[PDB]
Design a protein around this ligand. Structure first.
Ligand SMILES: Nc1nc2c(ncn2[C@@H]2O[C@@H]3COP(=O)(O)O[C@H]4[C@@H](O)[C@H](n5cnc6c(N)ncnc65)O[C@@H]4COP(=O)(O)O[C@H]3[C@H]2O)c(=O)[nH]1
Ligand SMILES: Nc1nc2c(ncn2[C@@H]2O[C@@H]3COP(=O)(O)O[C@H]4[C@@H](O)[C@H](n5cnc6c(N)ncnc65)O[C@@H]4COP(=O)(O)O[C@H]3[C@H]2O)c(=O)[nH]1
Ligand SMILES: Nc1nc2c(ncn2[C@@H]2O[C@@H]3COP(=O)(O)O[C@H]4[C@@H](O)[C@H](n5cnc6c(N)ncnc65)O[C@@H]4COP(=O)(O)O[C@H]3[C@H]2O)c(=O)[nH]1
Ligand SMILES: Nc1nc2c(ncn2[C@@H]2O[C@@H]3COP(=O)(O)O[C@H]4[C@@H](O)[C@H](n5cnc6c(N)ncnc65)O[C@@H]4COP(=O)(O)O[C@H]3[C@H]2O)c(=O)[nH]1
Lengths: 343, 343, 343, 343
């Protein structure tokens, strides 16, 4: 009759906005409905995540409230992105090794989600998009909502969270000993896992949803302050005939353009499809754009207190504003989603 | 009742195998059906391509036969990719400028379709993929099959052909005066234009085909011998803790993994969508992998005198083999496609 | 039955985006309707402008098309904003004189609309916002659509255009000899004249339209690529306890915050009023934020060939996209507005 | 039906006139009606405020008499504006840090309404206009007269009152912990909160007042001895080609002209709208202008004993005169306003 999907983009530190918006939404539901022990993850039949959105997707899927994840986000964000290595993000340090370390990231998820629970212990469906560097193909960690799935049942949620967050430059690739393969972010293939989220319900979650059409699918995509990347007009008009050193500075501009264009495309097919069935209102996207002055400050991995306050303030402001105006946002929390019982 | 789509990937010189397979298919139809001057582009309701696939798609839709395109490819490939520039791909050359030149590529396209034909003159539907470097969004050049289109009616086909083939490293970005925006290769987004080709029929081509569903859509994807790129196990295991210089070589590994993973993802989406719909013979894919001992010679920008023969030999071989075996391949050419008359 | 208002924001060189969007909006109408010498000012019952939007508003009401105004914009942009003045914008050249001579701007307006035409020689209603520096009140130059108007019937249009474009820091205040009062930029009061444009139709324009309500009013607000200004979170967090030199650098932050908030405020009451009456579709806004990379290049007074291409390219792109999607945008140009007969 | 709005303008210590006039009006109602315990806030259905007007608006809406607010105004004015800081307003002190301190202002507000009352506790509707420096948009703190409001309900009144009084040059920006956003004076967008007051009754307060029209809306805008700021005719004539040293005297003249022009504009559209329906009597404005020699002493932050007497004397003088003459002023205090109960 109705299927609700929560999609979280990958934004690193900017995932604080993703969790602050969800945490602020939890308090609004409790205050207005006079209830208690409200978890944002109980209203969604599928929770899709990618990069830092994947880590929050696993936390909500297990059963933790967004406020608890938000509390762990604040203390851990400084440890995950120390200021000693943020200032050393220059050429010869990057040319020698990846910045930061995976151990602070590993410990943060361990307290957040655990170190033993696997996908077969989850009562909520989840997707953790990632790419397999060993084979070159994208590998999507997910709960066995398909009865015939025999691969992701006994991985461990911490392995999926570490795999999708192992940024190609910001972190070392994550080795899963169970799979004997190395992994990287799902943002390389889908920074906005909202289109692929709709696909899974249509073709794979048929045991639970025998008749699933896009009209009965509602998507609540919470962005991470999506940056609209583009090459500067002066560089394009002046350095078009150059190469690498001037245009496409090292590999940076090629991948960032590749990520942004791919991210835009998946959103475009998501948008283009919905107007075809005239059901655009089913897609609720809650995201904004960083102002130019704030854009140079709020980066992917900036843990400074000033920008952390800005991310928290943006999430609190957007959550309250969109709840008042967007009626479709309020419809996600009218009823609790049925728990996922593996077949 | 039936919709046919031709999808062509991007491989550079390896696109000769795409046109050699189409050229040999044209001769087979003439020999068996006892006809003359058959056009391989007259049996498709929509022709979509990327990079070298886009140039071939534009040429086929303009009315030029695949055999004419085949002989044009042979002579021009030595000019588009000169031996002196191919041999001079040192790091300092790529760091100083872009290898190869855009002038020889411009002449090859001009000699085949012209320099004045626009998308409004074509009698065959066309979908060309490109990346708008000025904005970051993917721009898809197309004929006005949807009457509401008001952007691409007066852009020359040579402008779209040069834009989609503008490889980020192997060519300078193509500047379109009619749009004042710079463009890069369409292979950064949709190197396999198979999934997006079906989407256009179900979204934008609703005028000619009102009741269009994937069950009535047959896709003939002709690959360009694309290798399954992956990071070597020795480099992954030995250098997972390094950066740029060792792991993610400068930027090539990050970009190359991103393209193949996205290309895999779009291919996977098509396969998964078709598998669920219990029809898979609709997707006729004719592609192969280069043997390891021959993969070091057949490069996307290497022509030589043997690689020309090797790609041509594969095209003639695969055209005859799949025609004899794949029954659904023969069903593509059983009837000519209706002409595209813009509304 | 229906009243159409065209609102033009002020952005300096960014008005080239405003005129490029209007230029190809004329071209699309000329194509699809198969007409010639189309005038975009004939479809609007009232044209409202501010700063560079005011100059273009006066030109369109003279009976001239947007394409002719666009051609003069390109040649005069490098003349109104010389590169030598652009490079020398330090504090010593800003505290000693206004930067950018006013004569080059004078000739550009003179060469297009003339030098002797007055507000009584206009067949289209006009609103031009300005700040009367001598009295500290907003002075709104407008055609005598109110029959009791006896103030600006004999003032040259070049004086109103020169007054509304006098940016307080860039262009020195414009002395109107007919009124003996000095004037400054009209963007200090209403940088988005969309809201005040509706007020004029309801309050003063009661002779041409006796029964005017916001329900029967359609507004086509063409933006100026305006940036949503805000103080950087790093500066607010660390330097909120300081004054002037650190926070509110000299005075730039106070004026920019005051103008941006006021522009936001007037935009907000426009949205709230239309939301209350369920006529949100009547307000058609065509604007787009500049990316962070492009923001450092597309400033308010940069007329470099790279920035001009981007502003022209954005206008070219937006005009075609919005025409295809926004049906309400197409409905503006269905019929020509009756000419304004002064009374 | 009838709807009464009380609007209080900002200005700092000149708000003593605003509270003295309200205090004298309270005593007049007691004396002529022969009653006791008269609250001036019980006769208005909405109280709009800004800067010192907003602080008084919160106090009146809390339920406290104007005389009680007036008594604390005289005692706290000296500590809020100490003479040592008032005389030390040289450029080298303003260029280093903001004049005055917000701690005495914090205690003065705390001693009046408290430190724990929130917008959900108020029985009277209220506005608090402010500028969100972190985002650039204007934020309007208000009681939940709209049942869908979810943001300001749990915000302490002392935070909103301190936000609207944060004059950009005089008081440091107020950092709200609950919102993680910095705020500035609300007089940057509305020094005269009268026009926006009428809008709310027609837009947000549609639940308590379904059939609300500007005809049934009566406004009592109490001024703050507002000065009609303008640039000196000698300066505009002698120095019109200079910049930022002789003209604009740094940034002070630009912000002052922008603030006064915006304040003039909002009053202008208020008068124009009321004049349109011939209901100009609905707007009762009780304000005057300081004489030229007196204005050199009575500033926005002058807490001298002589200046306080003049402001108190003017409030007592105007309260008796306007009550005698203005019949519409007497009609305000004829029936107590219905208390506001949140839904
Ligand atoms: N994800 C997953 N696959 C499983 C599991 N058990 C068995 N499998 C099988 O392994 C194949 C490859 O898995 P992958 O995640 O490595 O590649 C996936 C992933 O790269 C991509 N994909 C998966 N779900 C997707 C989705 N919803 N949208 C877009 N792409 C998606 O398509 C590939 C093929 O999916 P498939 O369902 O045809 O084949 C599965 C599936 O049949 C299991 O527990 N999880
Ligand atoms: N491509 C194109 N768009 C046109 C044309 N005339 C008007 N438009 C409009 O411009 C918009 C953006 O064009 P784009 O091709 O640069 O971006 C496109 C392209 O990046 C992508 N896209 C379009 N068709 C697609 C498809 N079939 N499959 C996958 N992605 C597709 O989605 C974007 C939005 O498509 P849309 O149809 O909603 O909006 C169009 C469309 O309404 C025209 O001739 N071509
Ligand atoms: N603009 C204008 N005013 C004229 C003219 N002939 C006589 N007047 C009178 O001069 C007054 C002040 O003009 P202004 O433009 O300097 O200030 C104007 C302008 O600052 C503002 N205003 C006018 N129309 C507006 C509008 N539609 N939206 C917002 N603000 C507006 O309100 C002020 C008072 O308008 P009003 O119509 O009550 O009084 C006019 C009007 O009665 C005339 O030809 N033009
Ligand atoms: N003021 C307010 N807004 C709330 C509250 N709870 C949710 N909201 C929502 O937040 C939006 C932005 O609030 P803001 O005060 O920061 O910006 C406001 C303020 O800058 C301005 N505004 C509001 N009422 C106004 C009014 N009466 N007159 C003039 N401007 C007004 O318009 C903006 C958008 O108002 P809106 O009602 O469409 O959207 C609200 C509203 O839907 C709440 O408790 N108070």
């Amino acid at each position: 009759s109705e299927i609700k999907i929560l999609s979280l983009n990958g934004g690193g530190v900017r995932g604080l906005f993703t969790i602050t918006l969800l945490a602020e939404l939890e308090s609004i539901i409790e205050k207005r409905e006079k209830c208690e022990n409200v978890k944002i993850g109980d209203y969604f039949d599928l929770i899709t995540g990618t990069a830092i959105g994947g880590i929050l997707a696993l936390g909500l899927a297990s059963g933790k409230s967004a406020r608890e994840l938000k509390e762990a986000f604040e203390i851990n964000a400084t440890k995950i992105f120390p200021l000693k290595r943020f200032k050393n993000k220059q050429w010869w340090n990057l040319l020698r090794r990846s910045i930061y370390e995976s151990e602070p990231l590993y410990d943060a998820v361990k307290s957040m989600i655990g170190e033993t629970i696997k996908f077969e212990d989850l009562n909520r469906r989840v997707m953790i998009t990632s790419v397999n560097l060993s084979t070159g193909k994208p590998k999507f960690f997910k709960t066995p909502h398909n009865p015939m799935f025999t691969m992701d049942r006994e991985i461990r949620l911490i392995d999926a969270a570490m795999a999708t967050s192992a940024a190609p430059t910001y972190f070392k690739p994550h080795y899963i000993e169970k799979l004997e393969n190395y992994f990287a972010d799902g943002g390389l293939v889908a920074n906005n896992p909202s289109y692929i989220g709709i696909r899974e319900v249509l073709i794979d979650m048929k045991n639970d949803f025998p008749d699933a059409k896009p009209e009965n699918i509602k998507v609540l995509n919470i962005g991470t302050l999506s940056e609209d990347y583009c090459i500067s007009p002066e560089t394009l008009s002046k350095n078009s005939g150059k190469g690498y050193l001037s245009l496409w500075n090292m590999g940076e501009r090629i991948v960032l353009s590749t990520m942004t264009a791919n991210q835009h495309l998946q959103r475009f097919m998501l948008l283009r499809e919905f107007e075809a069935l005239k059901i655009e209102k089913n897609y609720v996207e809650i995201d904004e754009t960083i102002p130019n002055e704030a854009a140079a400050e709020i980066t992917l991995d900036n843990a400074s207190e000033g920008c952390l306050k800005a991310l928290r303030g943006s999430g609190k402001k957007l959550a309250a504003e969109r709840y008042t105006k967007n009626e479709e946002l309020r419809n996600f929390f009218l009823k609790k989603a049925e728990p996922f019982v593996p077949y």
